[PDB]
Write an enzyme that holds these catalytic residues in place. Structure first.
Site, mmCIF file in Angstrom:
data_model
loop_
_atom_site.group_PDB
_atom_site.id
_atom_site.type_symbol
_atom_site.label_atom_id
_atom_site.label_comp_id
_atom_site.label_asym_id
_atom_site.label_seq_id
_atom_site.Cartn_x
_atom_site.Cartn_y
_atom_site.Cartn_z
ATOM 1 N N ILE A 110 0.798 -1.213 0.000
ATOM 2 C CA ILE A 110 0.000 0.000 0.000
ATOM 3 C C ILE A 110 0.837 1.271 0.000
ATOM 4 C CG2 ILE A 110 -2.242 -0.835 0.758
ATOM 5 C CD1 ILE A 110 -1.510 -0.647 3.565
ATOM 6 N N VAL A 156 8.558 -0.166 4.214
ATOM 7 C CA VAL A 156 7.431 -0.475 3.338
ATOM 8 C C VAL A 156 6.198 -0.847 4.157
ATOM 9 C CG1 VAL A 156 8.071 -2.904 3.135
ATOM 10 C CG2 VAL A 156 6.782 -1.794 1.274
ATOM 11 N N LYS A 169 3.735 -2.643 8.812
ATOM 12 C CA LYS A 169 4.843 -1.753 8.485
ATOM 13 C C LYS A 169 6.149 -2.429 8.879
ATOM 14 C CE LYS A 169 1.868 2.224 9.425
ATOM 15 N NZ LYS A 169 1.392 3.102 10.541
ATOM 16 N N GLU A 173 -4.026 -0.776 12.616
ATOM 17 C CA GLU A 173 -5.365 -0.724 12.045
ATOM 18 C C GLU A 173 -5.289 -0.325 10.576
ATOM 19 O OE1 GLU A 173 -9.391 2.050 12.744
ATOM 20 O OE2 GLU A 173 -7.612 2.303 14.017
ATOM 21 N N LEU A 230 -6.889 1.372 7.190
ATOM 22 C CA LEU A 230 -7.866 2.287 6.615
ATOM 23 C C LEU A 230 -7.571 2.439 5.132
ATOM 24 C CD1 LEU A 230 -7.297 3.669 9.737
ATOM 25 C CD2 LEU A 230 -9.227 5.031 8.869
ATOM 26 N N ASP A 237 5.860 14.679 13.171
ATOM 27 C CA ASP A 237 6.005 14.666 11.709
ATOM 28 C C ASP A 237 4.660 14.497 11.009
ATOM 29 O OD1 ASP A 237 7.357 14.920 9.296
ATOM 30 O OD2 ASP A 237 7.982 12.827 9.224
ATOM 31 N N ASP A 258 0.974 6.873 13.082
ATOM 32 C CA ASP A 258 2.420 6.897 13.359
ATOM 33 C C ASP A 258 2.821 7.856 14.476
ATOM 34 O OD1 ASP A 258 3.397 6.310 9.887
ATOM 35 O OD2 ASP A 258 2.652 4.976 11.481
#
EC number: 2.7.11.22
Length: 303
Positions: A15, A22, A38, A86, A88, A132, A150
């Site tokens: 994604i 990645v 992730k 999660e 989305l 960030d 994040d």
């Protein structure tokens, strides 16, 4: 690893590429839930083991709120690091690009800003900064929700100049105290970033699209005025401040974010105060008159 043909997670598709690694859509073979997996790879032959970072990030699993993308698990295995999150279906960067011809309707902009401030208010009340924020880590669903992804990662890993694929990390949402080298970052850095994103939703263009640290700073100065000790006590003593900075005058927000009404311009101006102590808090922003008529519209998404 945790992802693969016979591992705990089956890959559905890639994604995206995050700042640190990645991101895959994946399916948990036991619970059946679809997640965002992730995969951060670690520089083991020079940094060693990232034990402090694992300790800090693991504390985020308890930081749950409807407008925060849930951190389901942290997996340190085969000396690599995975976050299970999660899932989305879209981020706000893609939604803004797809809405470039029409713009996002103002009631949905207002609803998104309202929900993002709720998520910030929650994290900040637990003493957790994002540091960030950018449209790419604001995730949306078809029901009208938006959530922040994040939180906590920038503090655990630092914000690099380039991503793991050597792409430039955007400076467009970075608060001026970071650019000027402040040693202490407060929760105000996130309010700055969110203010930049608010303006971008309204105008369909980035507010301060700097292409270097000094271009970012001077773009801010050209709009808000070059800061001085009047509006920002201590600014001339910041580590990267130079007295040779050009002195630009401040512009009216009516020129900066048309066609936002006076309530929205007043809120945005408070989110973009130079002095982090003067910058409005997330909790105070939720009470701003701009939100008196906030609603929860459904967006036109096609997945």
């Amino acid at each position: 690893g945790p992802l693969g043909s016979m591992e705990n997670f089956q890959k559905v598709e890639k994604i995206g590429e995050g700042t640190y690694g990645v991101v895959y859509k994946a399916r948990n073979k036991l619970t059946g839930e679809v997640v965002a997996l992730k995969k951060i790879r670690l520089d083991t032959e020079t940094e060693g083991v990232p034990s402090t970072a694992i300790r800090e990030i693991s504390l985020l699993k308890e930081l749950n709120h409807p407008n925060i993308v849930k951190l389901l698990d942290v997996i340190h295995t085969e000396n690599k690091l995975y976050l299970v999150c999660e899932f989305l279906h879209q981020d706000l960067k893609k939604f803004m690009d797809a809405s470039a011809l029409t713009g996002i309707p103002l009631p949905l902009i207002k609803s998104y800003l309202f929900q993002l401030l709720q998520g910030l208010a929650f994290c900040h009340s637990h003493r957790v900064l994002h540091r960030d924020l950018k449209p790419q880590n604001l995730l949306i669903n078809t029901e009208g929700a938006i959530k922040l992804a994040d939180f906590g990662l920038a503090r655990a890993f630092g914000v690099p100049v380039r991503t793991y694929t050597h792409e430039v990390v955007t400076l467009w949402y970075r608060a001026p105290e970071i650019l000027l080298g402040a040693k202490y970052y407060s929760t105000a850095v996130d309010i700055w970033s969110l203010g930049c994103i608010f303006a971008e939703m309204v105008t369909r263009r980035a507010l301060f699209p700097g292409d270097s640290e000094i271009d970012q700073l001077f773009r801010i100065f050209r709009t808000l005025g070059t800061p001085d000790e009047v509006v920002w006590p201590g600014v001339t003593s910041m580590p990267d401040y130079k007295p040779s900075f050009p002195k630009w005058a401040r512009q009216d927000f009516s020129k900066v974010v048309p066609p936002l009404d006076e309530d929205g311009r007043s809120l945005l101006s408070q989110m973009l105060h130079y002095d982090p102590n003067k910058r409005i808090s997330a909790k105070a922003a939720l009470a701003h008159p701009f939100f008196q008529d906030v609603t929860k519209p459904v967006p036109h998404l096609r997945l």
